[PDB]
Amino acid sequence: AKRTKKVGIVGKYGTRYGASLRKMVKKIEISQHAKYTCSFCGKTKMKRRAVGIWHCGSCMKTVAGGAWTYNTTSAVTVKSAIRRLKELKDQ
Amino acid sequence: PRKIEEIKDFLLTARRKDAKSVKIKKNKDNVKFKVRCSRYLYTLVITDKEKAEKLKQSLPPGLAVKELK
Amino acid sequence: QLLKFTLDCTHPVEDGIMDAANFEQFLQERIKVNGKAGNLGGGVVSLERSKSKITVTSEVPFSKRYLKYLTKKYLKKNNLRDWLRVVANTKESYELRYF
RNA sequence: CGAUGGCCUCCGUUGCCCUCAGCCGAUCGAAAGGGAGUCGGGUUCAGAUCCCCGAAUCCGGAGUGGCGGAGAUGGGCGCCGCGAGGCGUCCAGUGCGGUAACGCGACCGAUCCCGGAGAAGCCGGCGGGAGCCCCGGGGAGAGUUCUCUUUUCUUUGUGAAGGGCAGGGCGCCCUGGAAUGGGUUCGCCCCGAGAGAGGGGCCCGUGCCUUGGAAAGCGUCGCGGUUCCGGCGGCGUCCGGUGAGCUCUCGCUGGCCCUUGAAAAUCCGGGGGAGAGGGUGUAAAUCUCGCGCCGGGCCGUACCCAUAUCCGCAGCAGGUCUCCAAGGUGAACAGCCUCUGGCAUGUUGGAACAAUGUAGGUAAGGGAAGUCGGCAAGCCGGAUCCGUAACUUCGGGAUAAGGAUUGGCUCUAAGGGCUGGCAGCCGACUUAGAACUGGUGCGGACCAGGGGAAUCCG
Ligand SMILES: [Mg+2]
Numbered sequence: 001a002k003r004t005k006k007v008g009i010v011g012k013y014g015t016r017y018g019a020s021l022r023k024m025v026k027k028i029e030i031s032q033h034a035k036y037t038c039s040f041c042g043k044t045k046m047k048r049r050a051v052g053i054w055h056c057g058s059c060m061k062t063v064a065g066g067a068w069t070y071n072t073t074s075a076v077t078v079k080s081a082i083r084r085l086k087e088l089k090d091q
Numbered sequence: 092p093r094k095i096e097e098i099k100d101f102l103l104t105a106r107r108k109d110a111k112s113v114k115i116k117k118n119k120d121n122v123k124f125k126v127r128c129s130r131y132l133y134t135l136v137i138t139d140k141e142k143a144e145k146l147k148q149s150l151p152p153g154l155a156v157k158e159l160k
Numbered sequence: 161q162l163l164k165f166t167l168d169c170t171h172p173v174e175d176g177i178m179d180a181a182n183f184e185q186f187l188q189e190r191i192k193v194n195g196k197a198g199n200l201g202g203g204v205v206s207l208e209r210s211k212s213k214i215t216v217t218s219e220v221p222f223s224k225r226y227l228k229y230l231t232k233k234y235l236k237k238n239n240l241r242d243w244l245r246v247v248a249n250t251k252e253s254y255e256l257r258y259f
Numbered sequence: 260c261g262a263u264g265g266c267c268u269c270c271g272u273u274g275c276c277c278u279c280a281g282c283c284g285a286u287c288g289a290a291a292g293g294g295a296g297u298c299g300g301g302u303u304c305a306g307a308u309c310c311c312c313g314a315a316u317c318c319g320g321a322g323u324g325g326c327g328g329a330g331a332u333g334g335g336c337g338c339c340g341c342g343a344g345g346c347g348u349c350c351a352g353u354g355c356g357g358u359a360a361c362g363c364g365a366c367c368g369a370u371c372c373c374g375g376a377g378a379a380g381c382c383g384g385c386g387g388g389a390g391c392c393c394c395g396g397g398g399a400g401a402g403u404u405c406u407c408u409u410u411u412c413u414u415u416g417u418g419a420a421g422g423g424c425a426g427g428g429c430g431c432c433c434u435g436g437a438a439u440g441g442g443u444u445c446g447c448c449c450c451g452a453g454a455g456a457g458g459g460g461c462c463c464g465u466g467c468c469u470u471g472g473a474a475a476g477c478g479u480c481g482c483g484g485u486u487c488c489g490g491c492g493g494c495g496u497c498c499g500g501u502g503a504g505c506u507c508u509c510g511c512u513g514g515c516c517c518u519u520g521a522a523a524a525u526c527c528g529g530g531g532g533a534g535a536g537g538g539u540g541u542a543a544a545u546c547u548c549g550c551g552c553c554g555g556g557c558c559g560u561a562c563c564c565a566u567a568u569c570c571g572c573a574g575c576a577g578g579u580c581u582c583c584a585a586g587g588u589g590a591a592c593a594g595c596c597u598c599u600g601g602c603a604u605g606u607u608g609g610a611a612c613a614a615u616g617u618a619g620g621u622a623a624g625g626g627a628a629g630u631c632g633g634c635a636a637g638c639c640g641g642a643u644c645c646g647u648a649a650c651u652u653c654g655g656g657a658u659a660a661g662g663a664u665u666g667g668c669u670c671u672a673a674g675g676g677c678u679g680g681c682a683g684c685c686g687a688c689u690u691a692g693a694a695c696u697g698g699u700g701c702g703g704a705c706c707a708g709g710g711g712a713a714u715c716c717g
Pocket residue numbers: none
């Protein structure tokens with residue numbers, strides 16, 4: 001059954017800290033605790049160990065990433081731009 | 092403590108210079124020969140009886156023997 | 161399978177303050193087998209009187225401590241508790257001695 | 260290179276030269292952190308892991324190493340001998356087994372380099388093993404016996420260190436290749452980066468058996484020393500079953516972190532391959548294997564550890580860090596009663612039972628009229644079954660509010676394991692329904708929320 005109608009993971013916070021703060025931390029908590037797909041071994045075992053540590057359960061490979069998500073928009077744009085600079089510098 | 096399971100190595104350890112004394116324990120269904128060496132106490136257990144008292148005269152003469160009564 | 165027990169009230173009978181008769185019928189009334197005290201529950205358990213030697217024989221499981229409990233009850237009933245005492249000489253045996 | 264001693268052999272002792280190379284900084288800092296290795300029985304007026312008895316164990320040392328075993332003793336050729344076996348030449352020999360995980364009693368090796376252990380948070384769930392508790396019996400000794408009670412109570416074992424076997428775990432290996440997806444947990448989770456299914460390997464084995472070890476301990480009965488005695492004797496120390504039970508411990512697994520939860524001493528493995536041994540034997544160098552020899556110095560150790568051995572001026576109702584933890588009721592380490600153990604009412608007793616106090620109670624009718632103010636006291640209270648509003652940040656409010664039931668006794672039904680749609684044998688607490696019954700009494704003691712409508716502030 002559907003236990004709660006519009007509050008998700010932050011239902012653990014009861015009636016504290018305010019609705020706007022709770023719904024602001026909701027998405028971050030969901031992303032932080034979500035399991036991602038390891039780009040190396042293909043398994044869905046990329047779990048966050050600490051702030052910016054993403055370890056693979058079976059692949060046994062750990063990656064530096066965002067604080068709440070595996071990747072960050074700034075990082076992916078930076079990587080793409082730096083790849084373009086690399087290829088353009090040597091043509 | 093160390094258990095000796097075959098007959099002759101018990102005499103082999105009995106005739107060692109280290110050995111001090113051998114004591115004979117006679118309980119029901121078992122006969123135990125305990126030889127006291129420097130490091131361990133070696134126990135040899137005989138189930139029957141006739142092997143026991145035909146071995147009782149096979150120990151070296153110079154080794155002290157004590158019957159536990 | 162045979163169970164065999166003996167009671168030795170020789171000291172008090174030779175002293176002359178109690179006799180083995182009342183002892184024996186106390187047994188053959190108040191021995192209960194599967195909880196029934198009638199007629200020894202049949203011939204399953206047998207009682208024999210020797211010269212101050214009470215012998216109980218059976219094949220159904222029986223309790224030496226049952227026998228001790230019954231003789232203690234007799235001693236209390238006939239007022240010998242502060243004089244006599246029931247002990248065990250060896251296995252399958254009890255005997256009554258003074259203090 | 261130079262000198263010495265010991266059968267100047269071979270080595271030791273130096274003195275000089277060549278060569279080799281970091282320190283994270285002298286040193287101090289924990290009687291709860293790290294830190295090899297001792298347990299059982301007995302003994303005193305007062306000490307025991309310290310004394311005695313008996314079993315062990317760690318570290319360190321040893322010219323000649325004390326000794327076994329390993330390194331190890333094979334093959335080829337020419338021979339002798341009928342063969343067995345024995346001669347003369349060459350060649351090897353720093354171990355061997357398993358496809359693999361890895362195994363075997365050892366199995367050379369320096370400077371150097373790499374790694375491991377030491378060395379890691381909090382919480383949750385589950386499983387294994389012990390100790391304890393519990394149930395049914397056999398003994399031994401006690402208690403009740405006015406009536407009954409195969410009754411009630413106590414007791415009924417084995418150390419460390421080895422060996423073996425259960426039992427737990429494995430993110431270890433081999434065969435094979437799976438959708439009609441499968442395996443599996445309380446939850447999860449796992450799989451072509453190899454699942455299920457077979458067969459193995461490793462680790463922990465604190466449990467059981469055995470060596471220790473019955474010789475000792477203990478429980479009973481009886482003899483001694485008329486005593487000063489580790490006195491001497493008989494018997495026994497047995498068979499089972501269960502549990503979301505409690506405590507400890509081991510293991511698996513998960514959750515939380517803008518928290519990621521010590522260092523060093525010390526020890527070990529590996530990579531390398533500088534060196535050393537002997538020319539076929541009396542084999543040598545070398546051995547983390549078995550046994551044997553010697554030693555372990557210094558300091559603390561009594562007792563109290565708390566309503567009387569500490570600090571509060573004191574035998575002060577204060578304060579002062581920890582381990583062990585039975586039965587019943589009950590959710591419970593709550594409250595109440597009891598067992599092992601302990602104590603003598605807390606720096607005095609006797610006789611009276613006035614007032615006023617201090618601490619508990621009960622009151623007809625009324626029910627806050629008392630008082631600044633329901634201060635104090637009182638009401639409610641557990642559990643089961645119904646029901647639960649405004650408002651809301653949608654999570655709550657909420658045990659909202661408001662109702663009914665609750666004892667005793669006799670039954671019925673449902674909820675499981677093991678062995679050989681069924682049959683037999685065992686079984687642990689639950690839940691529901693019914694009848695009967697009591698002077699309407701039943702969360703009978705104990706434990707145990709009064710409620711509602713609003714305003715202000717945070
Ligand atoms: Mg220091």
